[PDB]
Design a protein around this nucleic acid. Structure first.
Ligand SMILES: [K+]
Ligand SMILES: [K+]
Ligand SMILES: [K+]
Ligand SMILES: [K+]
Ligand SMILES: [Mg+2]
Ligand SMILES: [Mg+2]
Ligand SMILES: [Mg+2]
Ligand SMILES: [Mg+2]
Ligand SMILES: [Mg+2]
Ligand SMILES: [Mg+2]
Ligand SMILES: [Mg+2]
Ligand SMILES: [Mg+2]
Ligand SMILES: [Mg+2]
Ligand SMILES: [Mg+2]
Ligand SMILES: [Mg+2]
Ligand SMILES: [Mg+2]
Ligand SMILES: [Mg+2]
Ligand SMILES: [Mg+2]
Ligand SMILES: [Mg+2]
Ligand SMILES: [Mg+2]
Ligand SMILES: [Mg+2]
Ligand SMILES: [Mg+2]
Ligand SMILES: [Mg+2]
Ligand SMILES: [Mg+2]
Ligand SMILES: [Mg+2]
Ligand SMILES: [Mg+2]
Ligand SMILES: [Mg+2]
Ligand SMILES: [Mg+2]
Ligand SMILES: [Mg+2]
Ligand SMILES: [Mg+2]
Ligand SMILES: [Mg+2]
Ligand SMILES: [Mg+2]
Ligand SMILES: [Mg+2]
Ligand SMILES: [Mg+2]
Ligand SMILES: [Mg+2]
Ligand SMILES: [Mg+2]
Lengths: 49, 387, 106, 46
RNA sequence: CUCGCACACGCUUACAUCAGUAACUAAUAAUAUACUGAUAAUUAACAACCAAUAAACCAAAACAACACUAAAACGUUUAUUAAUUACAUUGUUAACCCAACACAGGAGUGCACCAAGGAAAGAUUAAAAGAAGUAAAAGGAACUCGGCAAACACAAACCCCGCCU
RNA sequence: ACGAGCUACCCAUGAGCAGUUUAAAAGAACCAACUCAUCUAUGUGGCAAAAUAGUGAGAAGACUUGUAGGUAGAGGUGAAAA
């Protein structure tokens, strides 16, 4: 989730769970040639792989 | 009393494309007039233009398919066709070979104790690497009595192999050189775990003009989607030793997959068919660089093609699963202006991955596959033809 | 005493700490085992000349290989030359090499 | 011998000499920030 | 006719596809790397981020064999610890930067001197004066503050002041 | 108050000097890259608020050079030109 404060992690902390995600994804048509298996998305800055 | 018409070749100092081709053909003839093979390699590799860097051990989802297009290689499933020669076959005691190989496994796994490992993760890169060093040394010495060639051969341990070639053409999309035609250049920087080099070339598997029904796959995307990244540095053609070395040919290769390409890692990343892709991609890129470098050390290049097929063998392994490959190089004119009419193709026979041992524990190897050992023995028993 | 320990009187201190007697020259068994021509590899002079050249000049793409590259290469190359004698003496197969083992003796 | 190009750009130097951190480390520097906040500057510092 | 490819530093979409330019930008026109509108893009292996303490070790880089004086960047191993758990984040375009300008100026390293990159003349007439280049009869410093400049010359010697770089 | 991103000097950390002549890597010699700017001619609101063309001096050192840090006006710095 974005614009929220994550819990600081130490040794033995419980698993971090997010129930209502704040992220939104756009599926866009590639502007150049892409292979058959590649799908291009637009994601917010606070989203990792 | 006979008219002497001047030739009708294009101009030499003009800006036209025909003039540029004649300028290109001018330096092509410079390589021909060169005598020493070192001077030919200097002229071909003295330009430092942009090029793609090809890694034999890659994480691409479909790497073998893309590497075949860069190489003009058609992959044939199964071992290469048998030589169909039943000349007196050596008698090898498997028990001695089995004990020797098992000793290599037991040492690096259970007997030879290491410094305390805090992670306790037991990285297979640090365990399988010394195992390959002993396995190659143990089998080379044991089979030297049956194969006299291995006695005179040289062993290389982690020695770099380089190769450089042009493939296809490209029109530059962006920059001030927009719209002009520039060839695509590729580079292979490989570091085989072990090498065996022989003064005499191994015999061919199939004739030079071998027509195979299957065709080389053709991609419909830029190589940047593999992904591949362009870089500029020295263009080197290397065989494991400089040209002055009398051992200009090769026998076999041994490759160890890194930690990032383990079977367990691929399963977690939800990759089932990628297990065989990594083995195939490693063999095609590594063997081609080795076979290609051998040809260019003999003077053969794009405009001279190849007279005798160059054959090298490869054994890709990860520590427990072994794969066997054979590569024959028939084509060296991969340039776009030189591949217009070249029916010949490069062939790379391959084998499915097979385990060697199974749940080794407490100086006891539970499972063992002799066919993998027998296949490894067959590779090391290949001999050059004698006259 | 680990690998990187330096002794000032190297021959004298090692002799004292070990209680040994230094004898100049290799033993007669070793020395008489090399003077016999029946224990020489084929083209011994030529192959060693190639081994030295390969170690110092040919094994690397650079013009001047550094010492950490050609120091283990020359030793391994010479090991292979004497390893090829296994066909004449089929008892060298009883040997095997080990790497970075942990040794302790008090 | 041909003056006019005395400014040679560098991000390491610019952020170390006129940066926000340096402005708050010296008592005279803080007064510079206070003057620019009072005047209504859009950019107090680099 | 010949300063070319790439990285670092810097600039910050000025790059790419399509369309428009009556006018704005280019010191002009065609036109579009440079002006306007819409759409699209740079994918990591390279690069940044990337352990601590105790102990042993007087012995230079110059092909380094061995030495010089000006005495020299460049670490390994043993011990005690170090979350161990696929896929983290970030830089990837360009004809570009600093000089009021699309300035004959300033600009570090690697590899080539080219296989790469570019166009001195918008169209005429062929006056004076001015700038740059080539050639010359006989004479060869008669010029002039001075052999300044130029030259098919590219040498020899004396003096004054500073020793010398 | 703000300025050593130009320049004077210094502390760190890096990077360059090909060929030729000599027992010489000798603040030696010939000559490039490179760094200074002697003489003359164009230029003088110029291409340029100090340049272009020809010609010159050094070019293994008291040498050039990149990155970054230090000294601030009753001062800094200076192989003194105020
Ligand atoms: K810009
Ligand atoms: K006079
Ligand atoms: K400073
Ligand atoms: K100018
Ligand atoms: Mg100014
Ligand atoms: Mg500067
Ligand atoms: Mg600007
Ligand atoms: Mg224009
Ligand atoms: Mg258009
Ligand atoms: Mg536009
Ligand atoms: Mg102007
Ligand atoms: Mg013009
Ligand atoms: Mg005109
Ligand atoms: Mg006139
Ligand atoms: Mg004249
Ligand atoms: Mg005359
Ligand atoms: Mg007179
Ligand atoms: Mg007169
Ligand atoms: Mg005078
Ligand atoms: Mg003169
Ligand atoms: Mg006088
Ligand atoms: Mg003087
Ligand atoms: Mg005097
Ligand atoms: Mg400074
Ligand atoms: Mg020199
Ligand atoms: Mg000198
Ligand atoms: Mg000039
Ligand atoms: Mg001039
Ligand atoms: Mg002149
Ligand atoms: Mg000079
Ligand atoms: Mg001089
Ligand atoms: Mg201050
Ligand atoms: Mg003063
Ligand atoms: Mg001074
Ligand atoms: Mg004075
Ligand atoms: Mg005065």
């Amino acid at each position: 989730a974005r614009n929220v404060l994550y819990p600081l992690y130490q040794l033995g902390n419980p698993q971090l769970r997010v129930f209502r995600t704040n992220f939104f994804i756009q599926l866009v048509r590639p502007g150049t040639a892409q292979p058959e298996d590649t799908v291009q998305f637009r994601i917010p800055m606070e989203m990792t792989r | 009393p006979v008219a002497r018409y001047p030739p009708i070749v294009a101009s030499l100092t003009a800006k036209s494309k025909a003039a540029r081709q004649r300028r290109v053909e001018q330096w092509q003839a410079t390589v021909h007039a060169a005598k020493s093979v070192d001077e030919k390699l200097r002229i071909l590799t003295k330009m430092q233009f942009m090029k793609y860097v090809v890694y034999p051990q890659t994480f691409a989802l479909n790497a073998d398919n893309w590497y075949q297009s860069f190489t003009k290689t058609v992959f044939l499933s199964g071992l290469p066709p048998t030589p169909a020669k039943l000349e007196p076959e050596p008698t090898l005691d498997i028990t001695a070979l089995r004990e020797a190989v098992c000793d290599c496994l037991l040492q690096e796994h259970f007997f030879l104790r290491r410094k305390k490992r805090a992670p306790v993760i037991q990285d297979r890169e640090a365990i399988a690497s010394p195992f390959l060093d002993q396995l190659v040394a143990s089998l080379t010495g044991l089979l030297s009595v049956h194969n006299p060639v291995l006695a005179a051969a040289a062993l290389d341990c982690k020695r770099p192999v380089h190769f450089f070639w042009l493939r296809g053409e490209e029109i530059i999309p962006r920059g001030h050189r927009k719209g002009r035609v520039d060839a695509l250049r590729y580079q292979i920087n490989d570091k085989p775990h072990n090498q065996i080099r022989i003064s005499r070339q191994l015999p061919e598997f199939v004739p030079l003009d071998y027509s195979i029904p299957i065709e080389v796959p053709v991609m419909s995307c830029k190589p940047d989607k593999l992904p591949l990244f362009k870089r500029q540095y020295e263009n080197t053609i290397f065989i494991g030793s400089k040209t002055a070395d009398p051992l200009c040919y090769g026998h076999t290769q041994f490759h160890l997959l890194p930690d990032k390409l383990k079977r367990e890692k691929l399963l977690k990343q939800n990759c089932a068919d990628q297990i065989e892709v990594v083995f195939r991609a490693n063999a095609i890129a590594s063997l081609f660089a080795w076979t290609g470098a051998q040809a260019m050390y003999q003077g053969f290049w794009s405009e001279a093609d190849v007279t005798r097929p160059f054959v090298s063998q490869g054994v890709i392994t990860d520590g427990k699963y072994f794969s066997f490959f054979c590569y024959q190089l028939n084509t060296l004119a991969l340039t776009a202006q030189a591949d217009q009419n070249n029916p010949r193709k490069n062939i790379c026979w391959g084998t499915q991955s097979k385990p060697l041992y199974e749940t080794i524990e407490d100086n006891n190897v539970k499972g063992f596959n002799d066919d993998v050992l027998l296949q490894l023995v067959q590779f090391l028993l290949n001999r050059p033809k004698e006259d | 005493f680990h690998q990187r320990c330096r002794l000032l009187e190297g021959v004298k201190q090692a002799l004292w700490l070990t209680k040994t007697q230094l004898i100049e020259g290799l033993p007669e068994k070793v020395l008489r085992l090399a003077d016999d021509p029946r224990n020489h590899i084929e083209n011994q002079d030529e192959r060693v000349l190639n081994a030295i050249s390969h170690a110092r000049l040919w094994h690397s793409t650079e013009d001047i290989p550094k010492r950490e590259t050609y120091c283990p290469v020359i030793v391994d190359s010479l090991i292979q030359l004497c390893k090829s004698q296994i066909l004449k003496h089929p008892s060298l197969a009883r040997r095997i090499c080990a790497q970075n083992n942990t040794l302790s003796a008090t | 011998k041909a003056r006019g190009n005395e400014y040679q750009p560098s991000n390491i130097k610019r952020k170390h000499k006129h940066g926000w951190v340096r402005r708050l480390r010296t008592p005279t520097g803080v007064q510079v920030i206070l003057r620019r906040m009072h005047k209504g500057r859009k950019s107090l510092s680099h």
